[PDB]
């Protein structure tokens, strides 16, 4: 017996109030990829760039989320489904609020990344899937603690070893972090945000 | 990026004002009414905010929860964690959930205060008979007809706050009277200029 309550404030007014030299630019930048591939690195520099150009944003990192909102979830397929589902719902509120939301979660199931997109596109919010792509071995020698414990059978169902990572087929962007610079990665994301009319 | 750097790019006129106004009270007490009219004020005055309403949130993030003691605990736990992210992002976050249990509201507080973010517990306080009279959604009559079990105030409990930052007597005040009480507490804590 739950029935929806409408807001009094439109997106257009929100974009007037949040962003200086306004225009509503609420969206979500969804980073996806193996552990140690470069998602958090890339998302924190993107957040830095954005704040330095007067564009309000927040970063939701799986690791951070997973000690607060999702502290009660593990790494079974079903928990990762629910991990991703909740954060898709959270990110949708941030883009609806007027902010560029940046997420950095492994998010290893295509079905779940597509659901996250539909949550946004349904609500007429732009959703940018960015594949952060570093070869497994590169991600592994970058590690500290986890890959080692996982090869020893102390972390069961670890993405890339024991559990599969499902690659996006045709994302908005692929970031080759083994051959690409941190600033260069960030610039590519900005270039995308330029065309897609988020950054002036 | 630091909170200080956020407050110079988020605000329409500078200074970090991230915080959570947390409304608690009976069904029909006036939570949604106040929060949305409060959301209207803050926006028209150049202050970015966002309302998280228990009914809307239960359509999305919290759609896999019902009204058991434990589910109400999880409902409130999740939105407290979300509200601390909006706060930390520099927005004034307005939540309006029944949040019937004092243990869970104190937990939502601790979540915030342990991140050094302001938390204002606002008791929206109309007695049951008043809320029942209004019965805006037909829920009280349905509850008393035996069509809804464990309804707050009838077959489950509401636990009143012990040290709220603000009580609003919606039975003796009008919407705007109530909105202004809120703003003046916000003025007091340098959230609103
Ligand atoms: N272009 C790049 N992008 C991201 N990380 C890089 C890059 N080049 C080198 N690195 C290194 O790779 C590591 C990236 O790890 P994280 O950002 O922590 O990965 S994450 O995907 O699990 O979030 C950092 O230690 C960083 O110094
Ligand atoms: N079994 C595991 N698989 C992958 N990551 C794990 C596992 N156990 C712990 N972790 C830690 O959790 C982080 C990833 O969490 P998420 O991005 O939240 O995962 S996701 O698959 O559900 O999206 C990793 O970077 C790693 O530090
Ligand atoms: N001062 C007041 N503040 C808020 N609501 C009031 C006030 N006076 C009367 N009301 C009325 O009481 C009803 C409260 O219902 P809701 O706002 O929907 O309450 S809620 O707590 O269940 O969210 C509304 O129809 C509202 O117009
Ligand atoms: N058994 C019930 N008790 C109270 N509210 C209910 C119940 N069933 C449906 N509702 C509806 O759901 C709303 C309560 O949602 P919340 O604010 O999210 O409650 S809370 O107790 O878990 O915080 C009420 O406004 C009412 O519309
Ligand atoms: Mg309500």
B9–A54: do the CB atoms touch at under 8 Å? yes
Signed CA dihedral, B184, B189, B191, B193: sign only: positive
Q: Out of B43, B59, B85, name the one closest to residue A13 (CB).
A: B43
A-side interface with B, Cβ within 8 Å?
Answer: 1-5, 7-9, 13-14, 17-18, 20, 47-48, 51, 54-56, 58, 60, 68-69, 86, 89-90, 92-94, 96-99, 119
Nearest ligand 4 atom to alpha carbon B76: 23
List, in sequence order, the alpha helices (H) in B115-174.
128-134, 139-144
Which residues have a Cβ under 8 Å from the Cβ of B131 and sit 6 or more positions away? Answer: B26, B27, B28, B29, B140, B153
How many C-beta atoms lie closer than 10 Å to residue A47's C-beta? 20
B85–A90: do the CB atoms touch at under 8 Å? yes
Query: Which tokens is A135 given?
Result: 């070869």
Resolution (A): 2.0
CATH homologous superfamily, domain B1-193? P-loop containing nucleotide triphosphate hydrolases (3.40.50.300)
Q: Out of B46, B59, B139, name the one closest to residue A1 (CB).
A: B139
Say how far apart CA A67 and CA A191 lie, in whole Å.
Answer: 33
Say how far apart CA A74 and CA A163 lie, in whole Å.
Answer: 13
Query: Which tokens is A192 given?
Result: 């995308």
Closest by CA position to A100, among listed A9, A190, A34: A190
Beta bridge partners of B49: B92
Say how far apart CA B170 and CA B179 lie, in whole Å.
Answer: 11
Query: Which tokens is A31 given?
Result: 């980073």
Rg over alpha carbons for chain B, rounded to the nearest Å, is: 17
Rg over alpha carbons for chain A, rounded to the nearest Å, is: 17
CATH number of A1-200: 3.40.50.300
Whether the Cβ atoms of residue A46 and residue A175 lie closer than 8 Å to each other: no
């Amino acid at each position: 017996n739950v029935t929806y309550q409408a807001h009094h404030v439109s997106r257009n007014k929100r974009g007037q109030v949040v962003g200086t030299r306004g225009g509503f630019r609420g969206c979500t930048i969804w980073l996806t990829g193996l552990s140690g591939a470069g998602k958090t690195t890339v998302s924190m520099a993107l957040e830095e760039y954005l704040v330095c150009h007067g564009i309000p944003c927040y970063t939701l990192d799986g690791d951070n989320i997973r000690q607060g909102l999702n502290k009660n979830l593990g790494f079974s397929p079903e928990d990762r489904e629910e991990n991703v589902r909740r954060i898709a719902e959270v990110a949708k509120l941030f883009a609806d609020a007027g902010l560029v939301c940046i997420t950095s979660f492994i998010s290893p199931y295509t079905q779940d990344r597509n659901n996250a997109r539909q949550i946004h596109e349904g609500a007429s919010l732009p959703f940018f899937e960015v594949f952060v792509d570093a070869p497994l071995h590169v991600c592994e020698q970058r590690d500290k603690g986890l890959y080692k414990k996982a090869r020893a059978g102390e972390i069961k169902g670890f993405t890339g070893i024991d559990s599969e990572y499902e690659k996006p087929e045709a994302p908005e962007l692929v970031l080759k972090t083994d051959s690409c610079d941190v600033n260069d990665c960030v610039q590519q994301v900005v270039e995308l945000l330029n065309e897609r009319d988020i950054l002036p």
